């Protein structure tokens, strides 16, 4: 069994700027490309299953939980429910100038517990392979680092691949998330052809990914910096309590001020 | 003692610890274990014993005197639980320094 | 070196990547327990969030 | 409570005659070693 979760960075600031920029690629066509991927993923195998989540600066919403047009109800209903659910998010959304960073950690969290719920509801007669495809486009936030790291290790622990399909802004932690989880990361230069990357690079699952040739992952710069200056450094002094990278020795660590002794 | 001869040279910031999976309640010893226990306390080596089908005196005193814990396998789930619990970092004792 | 984190074979110093440290920060940020509500308690959210 | 982030631990296991005993369902030596492989991996996975 294969479970594919698609995460769309539906941030209205970036996509709105692109609309104001008269960008060729747009969120609608992006959601439509996601729709084709979701359909084609399920279309690939009877046991294939999927979920879709979109994120907004305020919150994230799930897009997925007769034959009047002569076609299968599941595909047709999946298309309609996804369109209706995305429109509800876009229409039912507040406006706030102070908050613009896109939510990602909360979206991945819901996906992981959803996958875990599915991992329990699935019959033990069959094994379920799960993957998360993150479609990032707008800027990340430093506050998300801690929470994003939590979900990254949970996904690794629970063997979920994080596949990153970046549109514009390249999050250093996102390119780390895939590498830590063994997922792929790519930034598309030709946003209008995003669907080709999805079907060629992101469509194949781990079993297919192994038996196939794909561009090697981009080198990941695992930067490290002291919490006092946030400057990249090769040597940092941590403590067995705060475990925080300090710039230099101090009798008291500013985050805790515990009574360290000179040495 | 073999562990102590190794853990004694370890730095002070690192939590030195030993996990003992005790199976046969009888154990031969070349010297009084109480001296070694006192040495373990002084060496700040955290010792915790897990006894299988046995509730041994030396393991009881060794653990509780050193500050560690001595537990015995109730069943497979208890064994799984005890090892899972030991994966947690040790809570810092009032005698422990940073 | 091919594998991290590891202690220096020469300097006797620990080499590690920043995510490995964050892997322990859950110990520093213990999660607060959620209050139990086994009864429905008229919660209109039929679906678990 | 404060927690010791970095820790060095030695696992002591008996190799005595009682390890061959089928004290649990599987052979005690097999059971303990099999579960220790899990514990060893989890030890690094959490620290």
């Amino acid at each position: 069994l294969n479970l594919l979760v698609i995460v769309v960075d539906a941030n209205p600031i970036w996509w709105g700027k692109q609309a104001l920029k008269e960008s060729q690629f747009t969120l609608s066509k992006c959601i439509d490309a996601v729709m084709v991927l979701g359909n084609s993923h399920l279309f690939m195998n009877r046991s294939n299953k999927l979920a879709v989540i979109a994120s907004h600066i305020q919150e994230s919403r799930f897009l997925y939980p007769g034959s009047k047009d002569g076609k299968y109800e599941l595909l047709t209903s999946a298309n309609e429910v996804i369109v209706e659910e995305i429109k509800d998010l876009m229409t039912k959304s507040d406006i706030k100038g102070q908050h613009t960073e896109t939510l990602l950690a909360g979206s991945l969290a819901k996906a992981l517990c959803y996958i875990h719920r599915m991992n329990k509801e699935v019959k033990d007669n069959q094994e379920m392979k799960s993957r998360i495809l993150v479609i990032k486009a707008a800027e990340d936030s430093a506050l998300q680092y801690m929470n994003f790291m939590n979900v990254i290790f949970a996904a690794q622990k629970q063997n979920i691949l994080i596949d990153a399909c970046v549109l514009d802004s390249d999050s250093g932690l996102l390119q780390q998330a895939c590498d830590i989880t063994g997922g792929l990361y790519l930034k598309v230069p030709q946003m209008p052809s995003l669907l080709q990357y999805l079907l060629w690079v992101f469509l194949p699952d781990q079993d297919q990914r192994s038996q196939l040739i794909l561009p090697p992952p981009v080198h990941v710069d695992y930067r490290a910096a002291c919490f006092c200056h946030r400057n990249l450094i090769e040597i940092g002094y941590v403590c067995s309590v705060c475990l925080s990278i300090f710039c230099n020795f101090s009798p008291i660590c500013t985050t805790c001020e515990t009574a360290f002794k000179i040495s | 003692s073999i562990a102590m001869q190794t853990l004694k040279h370890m730095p002070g910031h690192t939590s030195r610890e030993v996990l003992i999976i005790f199976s046969s309640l009888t154990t031969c010893d070349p010297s009084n274990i109480y001296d070694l226990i006192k040495t373990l306390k002084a060496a700040k080596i955290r010792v915790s014993v897990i006894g299988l089908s046995a509730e041994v005196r030396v393991c009881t005193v060794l653990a509780r005197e050193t500050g560690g814990t001595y537990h015995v396998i109730l069943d497979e789930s208890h064994y799984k639980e005890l090892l899972t619990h030991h994966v947690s970092p040790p809570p810092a004792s009032s005698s422990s320094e940073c | 070196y091919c594998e991290l984190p590891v202690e220096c074979k020469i300097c006797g110093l620990t080499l590690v990547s920043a995510p490995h440290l964050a892997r322990s920060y859950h110990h520093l940020f213990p999660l607060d327990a959620f209050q139990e509500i086994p009864l429905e308690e008229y919660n209109g959210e039929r679906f678990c969030y | 409570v404060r927690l010791g982030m970095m820790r060095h631990l030695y696992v002591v296991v008996d190799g005595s005659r009682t390890m061959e005993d089928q004290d649990l369902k599987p052979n005690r030596l097999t059971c303990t070693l099999k579960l220790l492989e899990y514990f060893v991996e989890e030890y690094f996975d959490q620290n």
């Binding site: 700027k17 430093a142 946030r230 985050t255 805790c256 | 810092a92 422990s96 | - | -």
Partner: peptide
Amino acid sequence: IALNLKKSDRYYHGPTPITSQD
């Protein structure tokens, strides 16, 4: 020894470094 903290927000970022009409 209970857990103590003075500036915990710094942990949220780690090494990570740092129009209204639009």
